[PDB]
RNA sequence: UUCGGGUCUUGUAAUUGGAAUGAGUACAAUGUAAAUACCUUAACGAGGAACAACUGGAGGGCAAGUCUGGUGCCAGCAGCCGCGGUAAUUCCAGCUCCAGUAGCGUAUAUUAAAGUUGUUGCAGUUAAAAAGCUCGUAGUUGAACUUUGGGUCUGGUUGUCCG
RNA sequence: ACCCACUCGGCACCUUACGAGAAAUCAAAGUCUUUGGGUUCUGGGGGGAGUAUGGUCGCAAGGCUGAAACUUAAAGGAAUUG
């Protein structure tokens, strides 16, 4: 296709120059991503599918002005998820911008073992939870190959995550798909927010990629 | 974190706050990483050699960022008696 | 309707029923 | 009053009856292996779930515990004797990793298909149903039969069957009689 | 921290509190009071026979304009009278006056279904034969 | 070079062939106290293989039609939301399709869903719900403190290095 | 009697979310799916209904206790745009 992608931010300039090789460097230093093309460059195989299209109306003096809210989940099934929620006039544009936001909001997840680690991680590391609106989602580790015991939206979010086995429990008005998916997103991103005995030792604070490679930014 | 044979399966072993030992989230868009330049005998800032402190977004939001940095710099011999361990 | 006036109407129905019972007690 | 012998269910219909992806997967598995109904996949999933409940219960117990040893190695030896679990992964942690397709694969239907004496899966189903394949001189008219490793080498057409060598059968005998008469 | 007691010797009040709160439900209260046996047209009965008294149709609710063709039936088991609904296009004519009819539940836990007011019972069989067999002309009324 | 052989395979056609087999009948024999019935098996027993599989549904929940004709807020359907007012994806039919399948549909009861009984594990400012307030028997609960250390020997069990 | 500093107790108040909520908002309505300091009372969709009945208190007014039959797909809370 046709894509030039002139980089307008320093992170984008470094990525376009090919100086950042893995998305782990972006996630580690809590770097701010504002160009989805960075995420496209780092993760070439981010699959996605629209969770829901919802018509939302505003009551004006003349008729009812209706837009559409698209709930898109993007991921690579290898420990990377993003949840975009967008509102727009035309449904196709709403889906495109929701994909854009979801790519912007990619996040890493910490898959773990239920017990007696043998192969690659199959489940989460610990129990995690999130709460959006009144919807509280509780993700609990499950034994190997136990499937994803979750509602279809949460199940498909875990599938996009790469988590193959997990138990779930949702409390509240899980009816609303955006709230449920946001709570699940909060939980799965909180999976890397739990300090664990195997994460106890301190590191040397490797210098930030835009400090060591500040020269290649700042287009002169 | 560790596979049974002994190879790492974790990705991006995360940083931790240098003042509260709490990990830094990937999307913790309040946290900062300060660099303090090493100084040689005649006061010339040696380039490319410094010391880094990762301050979390939580302490910055609370308002204890500057105090924590004061203590942390005093411990590693940067500032003279700027922070007293007994308030 | 107000709960006050529904209460009062119930009280007046009890008025009539209590007088009737007192007549026939 | 005589002591009852216990009948018991052997399948469990799923909770969500109209899951599109699940229905498509069930139809894929039914067409791949010539299953008559979708109760077959329910039965294999129920067997997998019983095995898996046992496996997880034994996993919960402490390592080097007599219950763990005895029942775990009993289950592993039974499954490797069936053939679904390869000898490489006799560990009781890969036993959780078995899928329904693994037990589907060990059916006498698919085994007759693999050996090549039946060139089609539905051909294997009918050939089994017509009392032709005998697993060690014993005719088996039952498609599933959970063929085990120690006896797979003894699948062939039965002697009473025309394929194993006998009188041909109704159609061919009648045609031979008609040709001899005229 | 919470309204309930938490001590190791507080089983008695926890149990009696649960027992007193259970009456707030409707299913538990119905099951324990035995309201179904005493007050409902059938006492814990899924089906019940009866005799047709008259042949009436009742108008529907506001959003739905029609007249649903029902029938008033006096129950034989105890003598109560209830309206019941004959479910299909041309089944009203099939049931005749003063014949035994087997009424069933209406599927909404003994409550009026849809737009039909003051009815709670279907009609499954008439004069020994089922409505569904008559409607597709698989069997015919014996006309006795 | 347009081709196009179909070079390599996979379906659709009332075309078309050769097979196999029971569901049934039935010499027998086995079976049984005697008989059925099952296992075996003579002789018959499949071409539309009429030896013909139904039960519900096709707006959403919920897999599958905005095809055709009929009726026109009628008839009726609809567990709930709803369809029916002259172009009905919902009623009555035909076609196609979907789900389970020798089973499927309904009714009541009940369990999981129900973190809508909440001990684990519910809520009480306004959604239902803090007695008007205080004392008080029973009930429930109730501050801290009374030998903690060490040294040796020694027995099993492990992971040790190797015999 | 004021002024400055501190402390205990009380009616209160401003800012803020780094916590909690469906939010309006709360410095408690926080320390609650990372769920357990002790303890009492109350609620299980709306209506019928705080009605009838049965007790009990009152001279009376009425107070306390207090359903069901039946009916209904909502009633209701906060906030957003008109
Ligand atoms: Mg009318
Ligand atoms: Mg049909
Ligand atoms: Mg129909
Ligand atoms: Mg139709
Ligand atoms: Mg559908
Ligand atoms: Mg039409
Ligand atoms: Mg509640
Ligand atoms: Mg109010
Ligand atoms: Mg209130
Ligand atoms: Mg109060
Ligand atoms: Mg006491
Ligand atoms: Mg004590
Ligand atoms: Mg109520
Ligand atoms: Mg009231
Ligand atoms: Mg009284
Ligand atoms: Mg309001």
From Swiss-Prot, chain B:
It is found in: Cytoplasm. Pfam families: Ribosomal_S21e. One of its GO terms (cellular component) is ribosome. Keywords: Cytoplasm, Ribonucleoprotein, Ribosomal protein, rRNA processing. Component of the small ribosomal subunit. Mature ribosomes consist of a small (40S) and a large (60S) subunit. The 40S subunit contains about 33 different proteins and 1 molecule of RNA (18S). The 60S subunit contains about 49 different proteins and 3 molecules of RNA (25S, 5.8S and 5S). The keyword rRNA processing applies. This is Small ribosomal subunit protein eS21. Coiled coil: none annotated. Belongs to the eukaryotic ribosomal protein eS21 family.
């Amino acid at each position: 296709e046709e894509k030039g992608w002139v980089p307008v931010t320093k992170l984008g300039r470094l990525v376009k120059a090919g100086k950042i090789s893995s998305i782990e460097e972006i996630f580690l230093h809590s770097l701010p991503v504002k160009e989805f093309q960075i995420i496209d460059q780092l993760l070439p195989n981010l699959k996605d599918e629209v969770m829901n299209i919802k018509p939302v109306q505003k009551q004006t003096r003349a008729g009812q002005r209706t837009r559409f809210k698209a709930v898109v989940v993007v991921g690579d099934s290898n420990g990377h998820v993003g949840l975009g929620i967008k509102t727009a006039k035309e449904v196709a544009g709403a889906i495109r911008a929701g994909i854009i936001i979801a790519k912007l909001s990619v996040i890493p997840i910490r898959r773990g073992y239920w017990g007696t680690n043998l192969g690659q991680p199959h489940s989460l590391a610990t129990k995690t939870s999130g709460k959006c609106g009144s919807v509280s989602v509780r993700l609990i580790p499950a034994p190997r190959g136990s499937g994803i015991v979750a509602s279809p939206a949460v199940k498909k979010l875990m599938q996009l995550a790469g988590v193959e086995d997990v138990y779930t429990s949702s409390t509240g008005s899980t009816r609303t798909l955006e709230n449920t998916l946001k709570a699940a997103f909060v939980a799965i991103g909180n999976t890397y927010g739990f300090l664990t005995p195997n994460l106890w030792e301190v590191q040397a604070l490797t210098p930030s990629p835009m400090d060591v490679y500040a020269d290649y930014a700042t287009a002169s | 974190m560790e596979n049974d044979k002994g190879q790492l399966v974790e990705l991006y072993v995360p940083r931790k706050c240098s003042a509260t030992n709490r990990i830094i989230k990937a999307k913790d868009h309040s946290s900062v990483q300060i660099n303090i330049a090493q100084v040689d005998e005649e006061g010339r800032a040696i380039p490319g050699e410094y010391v880094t402190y990762a301050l979390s977004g939580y302490i910055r939001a609370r308002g204890e960022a500057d105090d924590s940095l004061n203590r942390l710099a005093q411990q590693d011999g940067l500032l003279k008696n700027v922070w007293s361990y007994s308030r | 309707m107000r709960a006050k006036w529904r209460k009062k109407r119930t009280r007046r129905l009890k008025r009539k029923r209590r007088k009737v019972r007192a007549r026939s007690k | 009053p005589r002591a009852p012998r216990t009948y018991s269910k052997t399948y469990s219909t799923p909770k969500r009856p109209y899951e599109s992806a699940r229905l498509d997967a069930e139809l894929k598995l039914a067409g791949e292996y010539g299953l008559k109904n979708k109760r077959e996949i329910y039965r294999i999933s129920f067997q997998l779930s019983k095995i898996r409940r046992a496996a997880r219960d034994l996993l919960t117990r402490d390592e080097k515990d007599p219950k763990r040893l005895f029942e775990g190695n009993a289950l592993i030896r039974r499954l490797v004797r069936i053939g679904v679990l390869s000898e490489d992964k006799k560990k009781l942690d890969y036993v959780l990793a078995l899928k329904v397709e693994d037990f589907l694969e060990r059916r006498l239907q698919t085994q007759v298909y693999k050996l090549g004496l039946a060139k089609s899966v539905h051909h294997a189903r009918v050939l089994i149903s017509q009392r032709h394949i005998a697993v060690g001189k014993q005719i088996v008219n039952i498609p599933s039969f959970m063929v085990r490793l120690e006896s797979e080498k003894h699948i062939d057409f039965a002697r009473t069957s025309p394929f194993g060598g006998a009188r041909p059968g109704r159609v061919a005998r009648k045609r031979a009689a008609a040709a001899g008469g005229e | 921290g919470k309204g309930k007691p938490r001590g190791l010797n507080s089983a008695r009040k926890l149990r009696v509190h649960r027992r007193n709160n259970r009456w707030a439900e409707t299913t538990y209260k119905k099951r324990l009071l035995g309201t179904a046996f005493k007050s409902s047209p059938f006492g814990g009965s899924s089906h019940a026979k009866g005799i047709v008294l008259e042949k009436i149709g009742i108008e529907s609710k506001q959003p739905n304009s029609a007249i649903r063709k029902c029938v008033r039936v006096q129950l034989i088991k105890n003598g109560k009278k209830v309206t019941a609904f004959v479910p299909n296009d041309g089944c009203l004519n099939f049931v005749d006056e003063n014949d035994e009819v087997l009424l069933a539940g209406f599927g909404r836990k003994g409550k009026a279904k849809g737009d039909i007011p003051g009815v709670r019972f279907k009609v499954v069989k008439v004069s020994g034969v089922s409505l569904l067999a008559l409607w597709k002309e698989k069997k015919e009324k014996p006309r006795s």
